[PDB]
Design a protein around this ligand. Structure first.
Ligand SMILES: Nc1nc2c(ncn2[C@@H]2O[C@H](COP(=O)(O)OP(=O)(O)OP(=O)(O)O)[C@@H](O)[C@H]2O)c(=O)[nH]1
Ligand SMILES: Nc1nc2c(ncn2[C@@H]2O[C@H](COP(=O)(O)OP(=O)(O)O)[C@@H](O)[C@H]2O)c(=O)[nH]1
Ligand SMILES: [Mg+2]
Lengths: 442, 226, 26, 430, 238
């Protein structure tokens, strides 16, 4: 009934600020940790337990750790408005960054900080009675996010064992870029994410920028908008554990329905009613229209086109005032479409969930207030195109050993580049082979 | 087990197929009181191997003991308890020396047996608790010899019946029922129950006026000898 | 009490969804 | 003659809640448990579904089981939830995960002993025990695994009683879960060996009943569960009220099952009509019989017109003449003679009970044994064969511990059941 | 619990136990004899990443009988005919063949001789028609008037006479109404063999106003009105 969030590096901490702002405002916890009596009527009770624990005096504190190597984003949390909400031990900071080197984070610096992190996670896990997974937020483009995220997932996988680990990962966008060494870090990251994650959700900053320009009416967006959209998606997926509904979905049934083979666990994510308040009065938002929206590639939060592949499984989460007959009519209409294709070995392609709590509205937000929403996570062979674009940039740089001396100086064998590139090549070939219809007798 | 097809009772229900307790049907575990138990190590072994006992084994034609000095002059306080401690040995030569020394000391001890009675209760008690038939037979025979050793010895053992008599009740009524057939176990005196009965009778006869009440208190199925 | 709040929420939901137009596009 | 009911999983618990509302209404039991009825005819058979606790109150002989407590908190929050005995709710701490092997082998064996202890305590309290009644879905996880586990244990412990099940199975058109074919195939394999009589319901058939016949504007799962509660409470009516021609569950089984494997039946209930239309047509025995055999009023997607009836049973409730019942059932047998198996001279049993369900002067419930049920199993087996040939999701089941041979055995047993129905479905002129 | 354990632990006598077990065995054998569907098997050339695993996933894992009785009744009514046996329903009728010949003659603008057949039914019908024509009119019928044999349906009476069925009945079940209503599967007015017509599934459409039907290729896929109509081709015998 509980979930623990681990935030690593800059993107993960900044997305964490938006997530905890939303979870506080949705449950009704004030920034000082209290719950006034008049802010609770309207929603049921004990619902906070998934994300908060209360002290004997009734103060609430959240189940999260914030991890960074430079002392800057956490000092902003320490000096901001929510200083008193978090326990000070949860905000852990080192002295210096991994300088865009995966090797520096993994071998030299993260090895010093990792044992404090594991002790804090242990202190959280001891104060639980039905933990059912870890949610991890990080970027693979930077040094500490890649290196410490991989090292921590390996250690977590040894210590806790069967507990589930779900990752939200930001990969380097195909043409917008922020640093030169992004391909090397993303390639070295993918081996750990392949071995040590149960479901991996894909994000691209270029997709959320396109979504905020086309659907919302923002001419000059910034990272807070993207982080608020990600927070809405995670709140939608975890709502099934926290509020009453017609058809609930526990995270293990999600994992059981979405993953056909143990390595084929990379999924695309999309969200339907991303719309501005001025647009909201020109359009109705019925179940079938938002269900039609989640399948258009303009709705995706990853830069991939699902029309170049075949779907294996879809999981549709509906929240708010919806009735099952409308969900069934929508799914039957989607199944009828000719531009949507499923592999012939997956006849029953859909899983449905229905929850009564509508999405919360944040005072400074840009989304409109709406009575219903749908969120989709789907497994498709189209994801192979994202890796192919990362591999072309890696091949271009690696043909001349453009920067390898930095990685080799910090402790890495030159062989690991070739090993990682061959492992990602095998993952691409697996997604090509799994999507081939049927088999021949010869 | 894998459920195989074409074997279930589906659609076949018949009245002829018919097929408040705080404990399991098997009952409580058998916490046996007649089971043998480990014999604690004794100090007789140490005193024999060190060489503090003033005696030797003379081989000759048969095993006997010879004493380097007359036994009327030894300190019975130091020596009489440690020989009683050796009564629970099993393997040779300790058992032979222990029994022979006990018999020799009790035979010609004199009037000095009486002060040492309170100090012999612990070895007697700890030898009988072992639930081993051989040591029980030896202890019973030594007790019979001890009661008749000198004067006033029997009267001193009356307050100590609470430490000796508990084992007596175990083998009081475990004699054999062979009917017409004769018994060959009498020749070597290997019957525990006969020894128990005759020792109880000896304890009553030499005990005085308050012996019967104490023995009846500790052995419920007893009858007065006199 | 939890039961009272759950019953109240369910009753208000039933009151809202009684109108088909509001169920569709409220 | 006492019945014990078992409700498993969310669907089972919800249908059970609606059933106990209908039964409490018919016997005039207040939600506090106090008797407030208005005729002695209600008291003389109250023992059949309720046990009497001291000082007037009655408590219902039912066991509530589920792997996650969400539904139990929902049923305790329901309008009649207070009547249930607190000690009768058994629940675990983690869900079935929609996995048959999880529901049957790992978390099942941990709780099953406490459920068997409660069921034995309830059974040995009855002065004379009638069959058990079980409601569960076959497509779910805890419903399928723990329901079939409990059915096997109760059939071992009470082999001389009746075992009756009502079961909902996934539509090929309106499904909520991807791994439905495996759970359905393993559950049907368990039921065909374990069950004495099994009724099957498609949610699609109940939606077609609601939309075409009842013209409901915004149907909900409560309406679906009311149709199911209506038929289940109707089958037992002759056990607990007087009538001109009494009937019993064992008498139904003896007349309906020609051979022990052919024990899967279709259900229907006749007086269904929308509030706007009801003013235009009065109820009558010809009208109930005509709706009763109309496939629009049957609760499965398979259509009787593609098979033939081996046997059928009709239970009538109400004050009516026996001549009209006999002559109507003869007329239906004569008019549709091609749909009745010819080597049985008369296929229909009738029964008449004096006391109708509340709010209707008369009603009839229909139970039918028809070979068209083979089409449902064939469709599930087809979807299984598409998924099994490619090892689509087997690692979950194998990780729990299942042998693939279990899957091949279950497939073979269902295929033989389909073959047995298929030989009797078609005519043979020779 | 298996059937053998229950039988051995029951209170029945030995003979009843043997009879019950033999009945179960015979039913099992007859089930084995039946036509069936082959049990599915996994494919051979299946790709990789199906036998592979992952570290987290590896950590999660724990590692004869039915005799035939056909009683016959003396003087039972005749329910078969030679003319009925010769005809079939899937092929063109004689009137359709006559129209095809007339259509060809009109198209080619000249008379075309008809093919000659050695069927005994045609010869019998022509003899009966010639006799009737000679009784009605003194002349014998010409070749043109003998074309009427193709347009009519012929049958035998109970005494062996040859006649014509004026108003044929449906070859499926139908109604004859009198002082009482009755259904006849077969009646002497029928021309073709008795058969049970196929019917469309009642639950073909979606439970709603949306236009979704079941597919014609398999039992689970769906279809709509895009470029074809799926509702008209859902008819099947079983
Ligand atoms: N969506 C989103 N992306 C971000 C955010 N912050 C950084 N990124 C992206 O993530 C990549 C940079 O990764 P960082 O998180 O800065 O790397 P790091 O974890 O700080 O690693 P070090 O630089 O060694 O400390 C770039 O592609 C940025 O565009 C954020 O708040 N939201
Ligand atoms: N008729 C009916 N069907 C239900 C109900 N609840 C769930 N279902 C259906 O049952 C299937 C889900 O099975 P479920 O009961 O969740 O399995 P469980 O998790 O083992 O209890 C889906 O097809 C649901 O639509 C209910 O109250 N009534
Ligand atoms: Mg940084």
């Amino acid at each position: 009934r509980e979930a623990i969030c681990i935030h690593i590096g800059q993107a993960g901490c900044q997305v964490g600020n938006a997530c905890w702002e939303l979870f506080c405002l949705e449950h009704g916890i004030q920034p000082d940790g209290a719950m006034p009596s008049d802010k609770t009527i309207g929603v049921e009770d004990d619902a906070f337990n998934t994300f908060f624990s209360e002290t004997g005096a009734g103060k609430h504190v959240p189940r999260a750790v914030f991890l960074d190597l430079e002392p800057t984003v956490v000092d902003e949390v320490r000096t901001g408005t929510y200083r008193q909400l978090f326990h000070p031990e949860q905000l852990i900071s080192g002295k210096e960054d991994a300088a865009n080197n995966y090797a520096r984070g993994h071998y030299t610096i993260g090895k010093e900080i990792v044992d404090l992190c594991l002790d804090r996670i242990r202190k959280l896990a001891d104060n639980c009675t039905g933990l059912q997974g870890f949610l991890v937020y990080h970027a693979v483009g930077g040094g500490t996010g890649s290196g410490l995220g991989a090292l921590l997932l390996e250690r977590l996988s040894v210590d806790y064992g069967k507990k589930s680990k779900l990752g939200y990962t930001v990969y380097p966008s195909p043409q917008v870029s922020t640093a030169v060494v992004e391909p090397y870090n993303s390639v070295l990251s993918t081996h750990s994410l392949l071995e040590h994650t149960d479901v991996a959700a894909m994000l691209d900053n270029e997709a959320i920028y396109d979504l905020t320009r086309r659907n919302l009416d923002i001419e000059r967006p910034t990272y807070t908008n993207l982080n608020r959209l990600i927070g809405q998606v995670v709140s939608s997926l975890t709502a099934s554990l926290r509020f009453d509904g017609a058809l609930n979905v526990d995270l293990t049934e999600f994992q059981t329905n979405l993953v056909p083979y143990p390595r084929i666990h990379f999924v695309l994510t999309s969200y339907a009613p991303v719309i501005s308040a001025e647009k909201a009065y020109h359009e109705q938002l019925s179940v079938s229209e938002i269900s039609n929206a989640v399948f258009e590639p303009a709705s995706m939060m990853t830069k991939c086109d699902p029309r170049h592949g075949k779907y294996m499984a879809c999981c549709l989460m509906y929240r708010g005032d919806v009735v099952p007959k409308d969900v069934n009519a929508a799914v039957a209409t989607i199944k009828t479409k000719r531009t949507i294709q499923f592999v012939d070995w997956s006849p029953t392609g859909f899983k449905c969930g229905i929850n009564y709590q509508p999405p919360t509205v944040v005072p400074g937000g840009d989304l409109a207030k709406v009575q219903r929403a749908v969120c989709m996570i789907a497994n498709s062979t189209a994801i192979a195109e994202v890796f192919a674009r990362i591999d072309h940039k890696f091949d271009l740089m690696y043909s001349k050993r453009a920067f390898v001396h930095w990685y080799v100086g910090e402790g890495m064998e030159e062989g690991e580049f070739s090993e990682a590139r061959e492992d990602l090549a095998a993952l691409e070939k697996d997604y090509e082979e799994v999507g081939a219809e049927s088999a021949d007798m010869d | 087990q894998i459920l195989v097809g074409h074997t279930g009772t589906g659609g076949m229900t018949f009245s002829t197929f018919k097929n408040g307790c705080f404990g399991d049907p098997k009952g409580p575990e058998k916490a046996g009181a007649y089971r043998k138990r480990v014999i604690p190590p004794t100090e007789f072994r140490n005193y024999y191997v060190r060489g503090d006992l003033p005696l030797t084994i003379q081989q000759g034609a048969s095993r006997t003991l010879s004493w380097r000095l007359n036994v009327s002059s030894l300190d019975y306080h130091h020596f009489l308890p440690i020989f009683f401690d050796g009564l629970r040995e099993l393997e040779e030569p300790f058992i032979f020396v222990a029994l022979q020394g006990c018999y020799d000391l009790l035979e010609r001890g004199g009037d000095k047996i009486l002060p040492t009675i309170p100090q012999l209760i612990v070895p007697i008690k700890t030898a009988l608790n072992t639930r081993h038939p051989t040591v029980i037979i030896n202890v019973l025979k030594v007790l019979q010899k001890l009661v008749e050793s000198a004067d006033f010895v029997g009267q001193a053992l009356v307050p100590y019946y609470r430490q000796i008599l508990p084992v007596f009740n175990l083998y009081k009524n475990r004699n054999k029922n062979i009917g017409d057939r004769i018994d060959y176990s009498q020749t070597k005196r290997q019957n525990i129950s006969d020894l128990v009965n005759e020792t109880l009778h000896l304890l009553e006869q030499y005990g005085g006026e308050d012996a019967y009440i104490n023995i009846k208190y500790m052995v419920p199925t007893y009858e007065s000898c006199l | 009490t939890t039961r009272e709040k759950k019953r109240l929420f369910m009753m208000q939901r039933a009151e809202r969804l009684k109108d088909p137009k509001m169920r569709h596009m409220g | 003659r006492e019945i014990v009911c078992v409700q498993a999983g969310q669907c089972g618990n919800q249908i059970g809640s609606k059933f106990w509302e209908v039964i409490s209404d018919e016997h005039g039991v207040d939600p506090t448990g106090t008797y407030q009825g208005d005729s002695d005819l209600q008291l003389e058979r109250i023992n059949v579904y309720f046990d009497e606790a001291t000082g007037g109150r009655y408590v219902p002989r039912s066991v509530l089981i589920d792997l996650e407590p969400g539904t139990m908190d929902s049923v305790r929050a329901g309008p009649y939830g207070q009547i249930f005995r607190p000690d009768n709710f058994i629940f675990g701490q983690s869900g079935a995960g929609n996995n048959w092997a999880k529901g049957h082998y790992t978390e099942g064996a941990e709780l099953i002993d406490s459920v068997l202890d409660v069921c034995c305590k309830e059974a040995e309290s009855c002065d004379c025990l009638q069959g058990f009644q079980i409601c569960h879905s076959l497509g779910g996880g805890t419903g399928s695994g723990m329901g079939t586990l409990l059915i096997s244990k109760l059939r071992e412990q009470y082999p001389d009683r009746i075992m009756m099940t009502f079961s909902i199975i996934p539509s090929p058109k309106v499904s909520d879960t991807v791994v439905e074919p495996y759970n359905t195939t393993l559950s049907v394999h368990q039921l065909v060996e374990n069950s004495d009589e099994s009724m099957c319901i498609d949610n699609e058939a109940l939606y077609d009943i609601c939309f075409r016949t009842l013209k409901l504007t915004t149907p909900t799962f409560g309406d679906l569960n009311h149709l199911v509660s209506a038929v289940v409470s109707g089958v037992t009516c002759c056990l607990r009220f007087p009538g001109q021609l009494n009937s019993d569950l064992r008498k139904l089984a003896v007349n309906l099952v020609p051979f022990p494997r052919l024990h899967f039946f279709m259900m229907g209930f006749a007086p269904l009509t929308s509030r706007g239309s009801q003013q235009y047509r009065g109820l009558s025995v010809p009208e109930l019989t005509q709706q009763m055999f109309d496939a629009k009023n049957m609760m499965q997607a398979a259509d009787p017109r593609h098979g033939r009836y081996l046997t059928a049973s009709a239970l009538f409730r109400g004050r009516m003449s026996t001549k009209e019942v006999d002559e109507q059932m003869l007329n239906v047998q004569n008019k549709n003679s091609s749909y009745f198996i010819e080597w049985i001279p008369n296929n229909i049993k009738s029964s008449v009970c004096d006391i109708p369900p509340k709010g209707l002067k008369m009603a009839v419930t229909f139970i039918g044994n028809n070979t068209c049920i083979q089409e449902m199993f064939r469709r599930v087996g087809e979807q299984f064969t598409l998924m099994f040939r490619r090892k689509a999701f087997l690692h979950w089941y194998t990780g729990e511990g299942m042998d693939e041979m279990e899957f091949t055995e279950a497939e073979s047993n269902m295929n033989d059941l389909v073959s047995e129905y298929q030989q009797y479905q078609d005519a043979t002129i020779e | 619990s298996t059937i053998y354990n229950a039988v051995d632990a029951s209170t029945l006598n030995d003979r009843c136990r043997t009879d019950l077990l033999d009945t179960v065995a015979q039913l099992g054998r007859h089930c084995e004899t039946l036509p069936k569907k082959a049990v599915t098997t996994a494919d051979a050339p299946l790709p990789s990443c199906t036998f592979n695993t992952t570290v987290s996933r590896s950590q999660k894992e724990i590692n004869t009988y039915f005799k035939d009785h056909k009683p016959k009744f003396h003087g039972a009514l005749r329910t078969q005919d030679c003319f009925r046996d010769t005809r079939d329903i899937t092929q063109l009728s004689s009137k359709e063949k006559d129209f095809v010949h007339r259509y060809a003659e009109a198209k080619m603008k000249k008379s075309i001789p008809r093919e000659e057949s050695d069927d005994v039914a045609k010869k019998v019908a022509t003899e009966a028609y010639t006799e009737a024509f000679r009784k009605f009119k003194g002349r014998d019928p010409t070749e043109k008037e003998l074309l009427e044999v193709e347009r009519l349906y012929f049958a035998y009476a109970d005494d062996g006479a040859v006649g014509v069925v004026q108003k044929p009945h449906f070859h499926g079940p139908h109604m004859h109404v009198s002082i009482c209503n009755r259904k006849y599967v077969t009646c002497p007015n029928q021309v073709y063999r008795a058969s049970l017509p196929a019917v469309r599934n009642a639950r073909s459409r979606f439970p709603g106003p949306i236009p979704v039907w079941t597919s014609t290729k398999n039992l689970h896929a769906v279809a709509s009105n895009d470029t074809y109509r799926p509702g008209v081709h859902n008819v099947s015998k079983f």
